[PDB]
Symmetry: D2
Subunit: 217 residues, 4 copies
Amino acid sequence: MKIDILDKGFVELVDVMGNDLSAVRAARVSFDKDEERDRHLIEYLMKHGHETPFEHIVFTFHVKAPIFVARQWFRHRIASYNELSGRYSKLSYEFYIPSPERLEGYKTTIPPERVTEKISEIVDKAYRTYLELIESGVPRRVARIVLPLNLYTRFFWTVNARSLMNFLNLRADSHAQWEIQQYALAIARIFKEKCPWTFEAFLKYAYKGDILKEVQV
Amino acid sequence: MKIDILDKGFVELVDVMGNDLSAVRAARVSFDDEERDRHLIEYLMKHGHETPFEHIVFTFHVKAPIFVARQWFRHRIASYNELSGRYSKLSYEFYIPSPERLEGYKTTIPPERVTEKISEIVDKAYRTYLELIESGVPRRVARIVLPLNLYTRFFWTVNARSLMNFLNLRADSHAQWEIQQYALAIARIFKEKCPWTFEAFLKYAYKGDILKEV
Amino acid sequence: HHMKIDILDKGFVELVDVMGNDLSAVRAARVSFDMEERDRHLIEYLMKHGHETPFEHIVFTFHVKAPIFVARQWFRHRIASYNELSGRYSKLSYEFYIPSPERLEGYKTTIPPERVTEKISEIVDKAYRTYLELIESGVPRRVARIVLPLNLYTRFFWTVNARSLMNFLNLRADSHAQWEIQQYALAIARIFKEKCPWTFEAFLKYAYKGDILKE
Amino acid sequence: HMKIDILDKGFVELVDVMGNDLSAVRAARVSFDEERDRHLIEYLMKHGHETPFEHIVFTFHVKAPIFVARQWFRHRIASYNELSGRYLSYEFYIPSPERLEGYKTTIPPERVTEKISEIVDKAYRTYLELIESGVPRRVARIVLPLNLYTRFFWTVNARSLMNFLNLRADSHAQWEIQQYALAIARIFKEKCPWTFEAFLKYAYKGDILKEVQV
Ligand SMILES: Cc1cc2nc3c(=O)[nH]c(=O)nc-3n(C[C@H](O)[C@H](O)[C@H](O)COP(=O)(O)OP(=O)(O)OC[C@H]3O[C@@H](n4cnc5c(N)ncnc54)[C@H](O)[C@@H]3O)c2cc1C
Ligand SMILES: Cc1cc2nc3c(=O)[nH]c(=O)nc-3n(C[C@H](O)[C@H](O)[C@H](O)COP(=O)(O)OP(=O)(O)OC[C@H]3O[C@@H](n4cnc5c(N)ncnc54)[C@H](O)[C@@H]3O)c2cc1C
């Protein structure tokens, strides 16, 4: 399961431990099936705020996102992150350039395409300066500081279903920046595919945002 | 995988996400060479880059006396669900130490009389509990007379980094013997699922004594 | 900063220290050094819209004496710091929570509540005397102590931020919780209200999920 | 408030503190003579009993470049509130020539300082054009470079502060965050001298705080 996001971004599922029944077994503390009874229990748990059983469902995602999105993402502390660094992995340099349609709606004094062109221009210049600095023996740790906040980074994120639901409450919401809403929608889609019963109960009883009640998946 | 502990306890493995290669993939941040990969695991452990190990996760089902569970639940970086009578049925079993457990100390009464005195109190506390319940005292009030050797059960979901910290503290000869025995079983399952990480842990990061002796 | 509230027969919650007050959350939210109508309005705005991170910058330390059955539930709250009494550093005393007869009304028990209290006293006394005899005989405390009942009192220090404290109250200041833990939660609430009145009142108005704090 | 200037425009400032060395002593004894108390601190640190140090808490106000803030925010056992724009000002970290001498480079270090400064100016001017044109700040700002300064409040307990110093007060860390860690250390040492000295003797894994005073 890999979903493209923005112009060069993605969310890819690496691994998953458990499913809806993992929360049911944890609640009962039994490693021991009755679909209607198990679904009823998931709804009951969610309705009455017994959220600890959902901590026993765990996901690992591989996310490629711009730094300004990652910085918001990394504010979610009840999770594990490893970000790409030059020490273990080859680095590549790509940048998020908003399309004009991202920008029309805002009343601006120049055409939205001219905005896109200006952003692409300054990114091109900053990257050229960086490469020029690296070419000259400036270490990458120093030279990278000129690079803009729309630089893509990648990370692995391991997170349990409860903390994933908190992430959606905050980021799958029209108050959040549009870019991280788009990532949260992808995260929601993957969560729904793997834990459909927990996801549906979440939407019915626990979810505090707007977008996942109006946008399917 | 299930390991019996104490007289009626156990540690069983419920689920696991990942293996040694999950830490390797996380460090390199890539989803899509045996010896190079082992060398990376060792390199991460010896330099303290421990975050990649967070991407290996276990769920265990543990049955343990309350005094053991109390120490275990101090490990905050993990997830717990403890048996409740609201969702499942309760049983009443108690840990009675064996007479070998007290061989070591120069006790005034034989170790078998110690075992017997403990059994005796458990029987009396349990029968008082039952008498209160039969009288109409709610279970949540009645149960307060029950002893700390009463067995409880719990699910424990924990990542490999936190599990290592747990072994550092509990797989150690200064910890209480009973929790040592649980820590040894935890260690055994960890080793079976993540042999490379386990080995690098012992070599480079483990601070206790018992895992290098048994 | 010092307050102590007696709970149960021999228990208590004592305030050891506090960092900050309501304005600490206002300063955190703005990243500033403000030190009123605007400031209250902001606290209410944060609480209403669930922006709770500013409340993490208010921190309490409590000293709590509670029975083991209460402490076990309490220590389930992971986003906090605990240090529990140890014979390694401090002398140990042996006290137990005996419920009063009034605790056992509503309940239509087949023996009088006074006799329920007395039976609990008896079995506790026998357990403690067994513990003492085992200790007297050379049994280590770590082993002998396993016969002691769940109503044995322990003590601990609890350091916790206001956000986590509000989560605590949501769960424990609730009529579905055991009456004993409710009594401890009410004491925690009491101290929290006294030190952070604006946050506490906004919590009650907008975020508190329980029933007993508004009765 | 102790305010320590770091880099060209940065700082670390102490907003508040709860407790001092005696708060860890109280917590260890669970109970509300200097030499006995100092001895307990050393005993705790030596034998790994670190939970008592969780009862000393600091709140700091930090102004740092984004590339430093992003490393800092990886420390999860802490509370952060960062400037956003609807509860700003625009300064940038420009490395000094002396910062860059010591690497073999093909142009003088002062040229490098010059080229960073020029690209920053261009990115800033573009950002200002976009804002003037009606582009919201939250979109326009994505052209700004990683050396833009931000500000945040950090609340952190002494145990977690010590883990932060283990990782950031070390020569393998980026020099810029080392500078910030030295200032955090100075403030820690002033408020908690016995804990700090004990940390250096028994627990600190880094190098720089053993060579560099404060
Ligand atoms: C010799 C010795 C004697 C001890 N005696 C006692 C005693 O008398 N009383 C007592 O109560 N405890 C005592 N302990 C500690 C007790 O055993 C705890 O149960 C145990 O320390 C839990 O380990 P943890 O905090 O490392 O694990 P977790 O709670 O899982 O934490 C894992 C790691 O995360 C970090 N962490 C998590 N939460 C926080 C936080 N809130 N603040 C800062 N860092 C955090 C720490 O780095 C920690 O090591 C003693 C420990 C030792 C070694
Ligand atoms: C030599 C070296 C190279 C590194 N290179 C990289 C890199 O390329 N990319 C990268 O992303 N990071 C890298 N790091 C790690 C990164 O710097 C850490 O994210 C940061 O230092 C935070 O440290 P911490 O996890 O101890 O702090 P906190 O997040 O404050 O945690 C404090 C303590 O709590 C415990 N803890 C907290 N949360 C959890 C949890 N969810 N599960 C288990 N235990 C927990 C741990 O015991 C930890 O020590 C590297 C580290 C080292 C030592």
